Design an enzyme around this catalytic site. Structure first.
Site, PDB file in Angstrom:
ATOM      1  N   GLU A 274       0.790  -1.280  -0.044  1.00 45.79           N
ATOM      2  CA  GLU A 274       0.111   0.136  -0.127  1.00 45.79           C
ATOM      3  C   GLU A 274       0.964   1.113  -0.078  1.00 45.79           C
ATOM      4  OE1 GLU A 274      -2.926  -1.332   3.199  1.00 45.79           O
ATOM      5  OE2 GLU A 274      -3.416  -2.762   1.658  1.00 45.79           O
TER       6      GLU A 274
ATOM      7  N   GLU B  91      11.908  19.595  37.873  1.00 44.71           N
ATOM      8  CA  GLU B  91      10.976  20.415  38.913  1.00 44.71           C
ATOM      9  C   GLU B  91      11.164  21.928  38.629  1.00 44.71           C
ATOM     10  OE1 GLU B  91      11.762  19.086  42.888  1.00 44.71           O
ATOM     11  OE2 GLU B  91      11.095  16.966  42.066  1.00 44.71           O
TER      12      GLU B  91
HETATM   13  N1  LIG Z   1      19.889  32.413  49.341  1.00 35.29           N
HETATM   14  C1  LIG Z   1      19.509  31.696  50.396  1.00 35.29           C
HETATM   15  N2  LIG Z   1      19.659  32.067  51.676  1.00 35.29           N
HETATM   16  C2  LIG Z   1      19.545  31.097  52.561  1.00 35.29           C
HETATM   17  N3  LIG Z   1      18.893  29.995  52.441  1.00 35.29           N
HETATM   18  C3  LIG Z   1      18.518  29.810  51.480  1.00 35.29           C
HETATM   19  C4  LIG Z   1      18.654  30.428  50.321  1.00 35.29           C
HETATM   20  N4  LIG Z   1      18.272  29.812  48.867  1.00 35.29           N
HETATM   21  C5  LIG Z   1      17.555  28.952  49.423  1.00 35.29           C
HETATM   22  N5  LIG Z   1      17.533  28.822  50.801  1.00 35.29           N
HETATM   23  C6  LIG Z   1      16.933  27.561  51.364  1.00 35.29           C
HETATM   24  O1  LIG Z   1      17.147  26.537  50.955  1.00 35.29           O
HETATM   25  C7  LIG Z   1      15.685  26.085  50.468  1.00 35.29           C
HETATM   26  C8  LIG Z   1      15.607  25.703  49.007  1.00 35.29           C
HETATM   27  O2  LIG Z   1      16.567  24.534  49.115  1.00 35.29           O
HETATM   28  P1  LIG Z   1      16.441  23.595  47.908  1.00 35.29           P
HETATM   29  O3  LIG Z   1      15.759  24.229  46.842  1.00 35.29           O
HETATM   30  O4  LIG Z   1      17.705  22.776  47.560  1.00 35.29           O
HETATM   31  O5  LIG Z   1      15.453  22.472  48.523  1.00 35.29           O
HETATM   32  P2  LIG Z   1      14.842  21.001  48.056  1.00 35.29           P
HETATM   33  O6  LIG Z   1      14.335  20.281  49.127  1.00 35.29           O
HETATM   34  O7  LIG Z   1      15.557  20.672  46.801  1.00 35.29           O
HETATM   35  O8  LIG Z   1      13.438  21.643  47.741  1.00 35.29           O
HETATM   36  P3  LIG Z   1      12.360  21.011  46.611  1.00 35.29           P
HETATM   37  O9  LIG Z   1      11.674  19.947  47.041  1.00 35.29           O
HETATM   38  O10 LIG Z   1      11.161  22.271  46.117  1.00 35.29           O
HETATM   39  O11 LIG Z   1      13.127  21.000  45.084  1.00 35.29           O
HETATM   40  C9  LIG Z   1      14.940  27.260  50.887  1.00 35.29           C
HETATM   41  O12 LIG Z   1      13.676  26.680  51.034  1.00 35.29           O
HETATM   42  C10 LIG Z   1      15.539  28.198  51.987  1.00 35.29           C
HETATM   43  O13 LIG Z   1      15.184  27.585  53.252  1.00 35.29           O
HETATM   44 MG   LIG Z   2      14.628  20.703  44.834  1.00 32.57          MG
END
Ligand SMILES: Nc1ncnc2c1ncn2[C@@H]1O[C@H](COP(=O)(O)OP(=O)(O)OP(=O)(O)O)[C@@H](O)[C@H]1O
Ligand SMILES: [Mg+2]
Ligand SMILES: Nc1ncnc2c1ncn2[C@@H]1O[C@H](COP(=O)(O)OP(=O)(O)OP(=O)(O)O)[C@@H](O)[C@H]1O
Ligand SMILES: Nc1ncnc2c1ncn2[C@@H]1O[C@H](COP(=O)(O)OP(=O)(O)OP(=O)(O)O)[C@@H](O)[C@H]1O
Ligand SMILES: Nc1ncnc2c1ncn2[C@@H]1O[C@H](COP(=O)(O)OP(=O)(O)OP(=O)(O)O)[C@@H](O)[C@H]1O
Ligand SMILES: Nc1ncnc2c1ncn2[C@@H]1O[C@H](COP(=O)(O)OP(=O)(O)OP(=O)(O)O)[C@@H](O)[C@H]1O
Ligand SMILES: Nc1ncnc2c1ncn2[C@@H]1O[C@H](COP(=O)(O)OP(=O)(O)OP(=O)(O)O)[C@@H](O)[C@H]1O
Ligand SMILES: Nc1ncnc2c1ncn2[C@@H]1O[C@H](COP(=O)(O)OP(=O)(O)OP(=O)(O)O)[C@@H](O)[C@H]1O
Ligand SMILES: [Mg+2]
Ligand SMILES: [Mg+2]
Ligand SMILES: [Mg+2]
Ligand SMILES: [Mg+2]
Ligand SMILES: [Mg+2]
Lengths: 449, 453, 453
Positions: A60, A277
């Protein structure tokens, strides 16, 4: 029975060598499964590798459309036809003799027919008889043929008239199941007359290469980016090992992934960060917020970032990308952020195989893998923790109305590790692992004493 | 194989370009899926953008009807014989020859045939195949990209009526209209594209005044205020402009309050905002807002706030998304809030809810719109099963706390992605002015589940 | 009714002897179930053991093919015309008469017909019945035990193609090949045996180089060492020789360690052992073993240890059992370990996993082999749902214990069937030498779930 190699990545292992020589093989499946692709790829590889003359019996679809469609994978069938290697026969004892002569005119070995079901409109009783006649005239000649037939259901009759499987000697069922509106390609060998094979379905994908079916232990250590972490890991992670950082949301998995990917680029080592994510834009800010220039690392060609959506493609598709991107960039260490993302809206079975393939391939190419997992009980498994060699669990601890977080090396295979739940805190520089909670009792699930 | 753009929002991405050139495409589906619609758009957009001549072949429906029906979107039939852009052929080698003549007569390759199964009532699969194959052979020989329309019986059954039409065609597009929970969901899928690549599996789409609207699948450090000063202080300065914040907690905690202040803060700074309500009605929203010292009418009078309340079981999730899309595209707000996500997940598949969140989240960040989605936790006085907390950049958790036979409530910034935040569970109270965040509970400990010590 | 042995491993038990004499047996199944195989074995074993003449009736498959196909197992066709033991009749009263002649010509009653459904393509159930009934009448009249082969469409649908063949036959054997979880499972069942008894329900079988291998369904006080001295002391002297020990616990507790020492102890006493890995690979096993002070290479060099690691989702549970069977039968070990059972239960039915455990347990005790199976408990830092703990004679439970922000681990002999054991939860530690069992936690209490006091 001797088997002929098809040079289809995975099929040779599943078929234990390839397709039975002398005999014919059936390839049933629904529309868009890749019956023709297999059919062509069976020939193409036969003439490109072993220099064996093959003939394609069309029906075909026209010889021009076959070549045009086959040019999607960069296969110049014309050039093969220009050398008299592949003969496309345009299109029931007439064709039998028409195909018999052709085979001899080229001194053949392999033949593809796409599709017999196409030449059975006019004519279940007659199908068998005429189907059995064709198979007989091919076996007598002694040419390995791949027969294409079409199915209505993914989990129903093997062929159209429920007879072609019984007449055929070998049966390969190509599937394309739609579970949660995703569509997953699986291939299976139903039987091989007079030889062994792997039973059950196997995940495959179609790329610009074609079908892609997926069927030492050095004591060298590497760094995770955090000094204390290496200290509590007994000197760092193993080179050919799989580490897992599991915890609640906002614990600091992505932070550790970043430092882990950073540390590679701090020693002229290529790394890949498979985001699932967050996006690159967001990842760049967060990284810089922690005192890491990811943009710089992309400028040094040491870090590659591949972001995508877990519900966009299938798991078998996600794996191919990882493999392809790994094969190209050739990283020292990879990271998947996160596995829990690649799991939502997926069969637990299909996820396990995915985890095995990634880990299996990550260690086959000697790559340090850091996969993260979000726990489903925030401040509160599916048994993928027995594949990971190291486990870094992060957990919060409500202390004096102040929501704090702790880190602990849950396990470390073939190496000593610190057995203490140390408290840590995040700043603009990164993580800072302090001491352990000697006062706080029973902080494995929270509510410390 | 080159592809021809169909200019159907979403399809051009799912097909990795569009429909293959000089190739026959099939579009099967049940009644009311939107085959004719798609068929018309393919032509309409053809001559209404690329000036690519194209002819529509009718069968069961009259030209006048088609013209009248397509007026629901705003597509006139002045391109028919009043321009020579279209060519409606009222209605097996006889038709083919006519179609072949019309093609060169108009000098075109854009063809749309609806429907083909209707011209097989004279028979009852072998004949269909044979005649069907001859049609694609003809058309391919002329080299005209045709869109063929077939009908199905089941959403999850044979592709076409006779279980053959898909095997003859080079391209297969299945339009679905699944009914799950007494709610309909339109999903389009590209089954296969012979010779090229595409996205696999089904994709949510909707039919509106524009037509078909398929739904396929930076980073500034600028901070915006949440409405509350203390909240901005515990967020390390405030929320991020192109970020998604989530406020979870039991019922009657203060999610709707935070949303009000969040939206208020927008209109206060002369910025537009949209409030997508799903739990209360505008009447009630105004009453509660003013009870906290916020004139939502004033904000509506300034044309800075738009309220869009509706029932989360009155329409499909894709329909809700389109509504959010248009309302955002029209009003062009600085920040949008959804109250609540949880209300939109009830009576919905976890798969369909994820895609909805992704689309809304994705579009919110694509237009640099600060988003505040709320969610009501299952445990009332006493986890977040749904894995939608990894998509939110910020999480504001509100929790009840029983203290000496007194139902008090606590607030805490659970996390702040790429920013420092307060790590303390402060107690907060609601009055006739708004939220009053105070100090944390240093005495009573372990209020993760409630009931400290 | 007397029975004729088929010498098919397992079938002779399920049929309570074998196939009835002078009676027609049906063997229906889907394509690739192993009908022809069974058919051949019935004859092969007939003249290759009992010197009982027998003729094979072909139809769709040629004699040469059959001969060639059966060479996968190692069965030569030198018994055909090079001895007169076989009689392949290449291919309704015409055939019957020929079959009737061949029987007495060779002076036999062992007949195998494959396939019968293939000789009903000239028709399309009444005719089948009538013609089918006449065949069994003929054969029964000659008094030749024939094995008839029919094909099916569904694993859980009609017995035969026309839903009649089973009603005419005296014996019905259904070969199945169910696909659950993208994994195939071969199961054979005897539906009925007119005039005699049999086992009911399906039984797991496998096809190997030997052919079909169906799987149907003492006590010394000699003690063996577990590798660890203290462990032997808490076991009241050590494990029993013909006993099954189970070591459960969370991941990273020390199950693989105990297995290593258990297998080490064998090779140390000049005894063979097999380690069936399913979680780690040999490469990694060697690395971890040596980290604890164990040279697995040395043990492999002495031909006292065999490592057989593989993925628990690469093959069916029946396939894993056969592998264990052959590896044990070949190597003939003093003790075998499985690491782990839990890894073999994932993506498996609780029914199929039980039978697997029974078979492995049963065979381990039948050959007087000390068995050490491990299992990873679901609760990590925090029951054993599966009811496989009643099969194990000994249970060694490993449990984590949080003590002053220090992740320690504890060991305890949960039970010891027909022997005294220690009733204390001793703390243990892992170093570069192996396990070091210490004292129990007399202060901290209630470590059943963890987190004592
Ligand atoms: N500039 C910063 N200064 C201080 N603490 C920070 C800063 N940036 C992020 N954090 C802390 O780190 C956290 C985020 O870390 P990360 O994104 O690695 O977490 P995660 O467990 O991988 O999160 P998810 O499950 O959402 O991916 C924030 O909630 C905060 O408490
Ligand atoms: Mg994370
Ligand atoms: N040496 C071998 N090792 C393992 N499996 C084998 C071996 N030889 C044959 N097999 C198995 O036996 C199957 C074929 O058995 P058999 O020919 O009896 O099937 P069948 O059910 O009669 O098939 P059909 O219905 O198509 O005639 C193969 O698919 C293969 O899985
Ligand atoms: N202006 C509009 N707004 C919203 N929906 C509309 C509008 N115009 C049409 N529709 C939708 O389109 C549907 C009809 O589309 P179309 O005529 O393409 O269907 P079809 O699948 O071709 O039907 P059939 O199989 O009966 O020919 C209506 O049921 C309606 O839901
Ligand atoms: N270049 C490419 N890159 C990626 N995927 C491709 C590419 N070319 C083709 N494909 C995929 O493979 C499919 C082609 O498979 P093929 O044409 O062999 O299907 P088939 O099963 O023979 O269909 P039919 O039964 O309708 O003849 C496409 O539909 C697409 O999903
Ligand atoms: N005028 C007021 N003075 C004091 N407290 C008030 C006033 N108006 C509302 N509240 C408080 O606010 C609570 C409701 O706040 P809000 O509606 O924002 O909560 P919610 O968690 O979003 O509720 P739901 O889940 O029901 O939508 C009431 O239960 C009450 O305690
Ligand atoms: N001596 C026995 N001891 C135990 N069970 C027996 C014995 N004899 C027969 N059976 C059982 O009873 C069955 C005989 O039942 P019977 O022959 O009446 O079946 P039926 O339903 O009439 O079959 P059909 O429809 O094929 O004629 C045997 O298949 C077996 O399961
Ligand atoms: N050289 C070493 N020194 C100290 N401790 C070690 C050493 N090697 C391994 N360990 C300890 O042994 C643990 C792993 O032991 P083993 O692999 O036997 O446990 P398991 O419970 O079987 O794990 P899994 O469930 O992951 O297979 C590590 O987590 C670590 O604590
Ligand atoms: Mg094809
Ligand atoms: Mg219509
Ligand atoms: Mg509310
Ligand atoms: Mg057979
Ligand atoms: Mg282990």
């Amino acid at each position: 029975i001797a088997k002929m190699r098809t040079m289809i990545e995975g099929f040779d292992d599943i078929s234990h060598g390839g397709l039975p020589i002398g005999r014919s093989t059936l390839v049933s499946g629904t529309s868009g499964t890749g019956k023709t692709l297999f059919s062509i790829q069976f020939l193409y590889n036969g003439i490109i590798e072993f220099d064996e003359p093959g003939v394609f019996v069309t029906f075909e679809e026209t010889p021009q459309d076959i070549i045009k469609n086959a040019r999607s994978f960069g296969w110049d069938l014309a050039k093969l036809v220009d050398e008299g290697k592949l003969f496309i026969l345009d299109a029931l004892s007439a064709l039998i003799e028409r195909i018999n002569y052709a085979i001899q005119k080229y001194r053949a070995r392999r033949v593809s027919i796409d599709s017999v079901t196409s030449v059975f409109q006019q004519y279940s009783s007659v199908v068998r008889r005429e189907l059995f006649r064709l198979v007989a005239r091919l076996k007598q000649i002694g040419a390995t043929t791949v027969m294409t037939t079409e199915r209505i259901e993914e989990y129903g009759p093997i062929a159209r008239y429920g007879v072609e499987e019984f007449v055929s000697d070998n049966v390969v069922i190509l599937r394309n199941v739609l579970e949660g509106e995703r569509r997953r390609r699986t291939l299976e060998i139903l039987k091989l007359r007079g030889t062994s094979h792997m039973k059950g379905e196997y995940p495959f994908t179609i790329t610009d290469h074609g079908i892609n079916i997926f069927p030492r232990s050095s004591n060298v250590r590497v760094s995770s980016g955090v000094v204390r972490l290496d200290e509590m890991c007994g000197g760092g992670f193993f080179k050919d090992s799989i580490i897992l950082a599991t915890g609640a949301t906002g614990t600091g998995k992505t932070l550790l992934v970043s430092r882990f990917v950073e540390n590679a680029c701090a020693n002229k080592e290529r790394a890949i960060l498979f985001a699932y994510e967050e996006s690159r834009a967001q990842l760049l800010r967060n990284a810089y917020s922690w005192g890491m220039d990811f943009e710089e690392m992309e400028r040094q060609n040491l870090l590659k970032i591949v972001c995508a959506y877990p519900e966009s493609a299938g798991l078998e598709d996600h794996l191919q990308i990882i493999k392809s991107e790994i094969n190209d960039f050739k990283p020292a260490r990879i990271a998947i952020d996160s596995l829990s993302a690649l799991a939502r809206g997926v069969s637990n079975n299909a996820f396990r195989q995915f985890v095995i393939g990634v880990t299996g391939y990550a260690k086959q190419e000697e790559i340090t893998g850091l996969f993260t997992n979000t726990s489903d009980q925030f401040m509160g498994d599916s048994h993928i923790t027995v594949i990971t060699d190291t486990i870094i669990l992060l957990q919060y601890v409500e202390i004096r109305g102040e929501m704090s977080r702790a880190i602990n090396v849950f396990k470390m295979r073939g190496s000593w590790h610190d057995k203490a739940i140390r408290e840590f805190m995040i700043s603009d520089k990164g993580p800072d692992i302090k001491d352990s909670f000697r006062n706080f009792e029973r902080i494995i699930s929270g509510s410390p004493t």
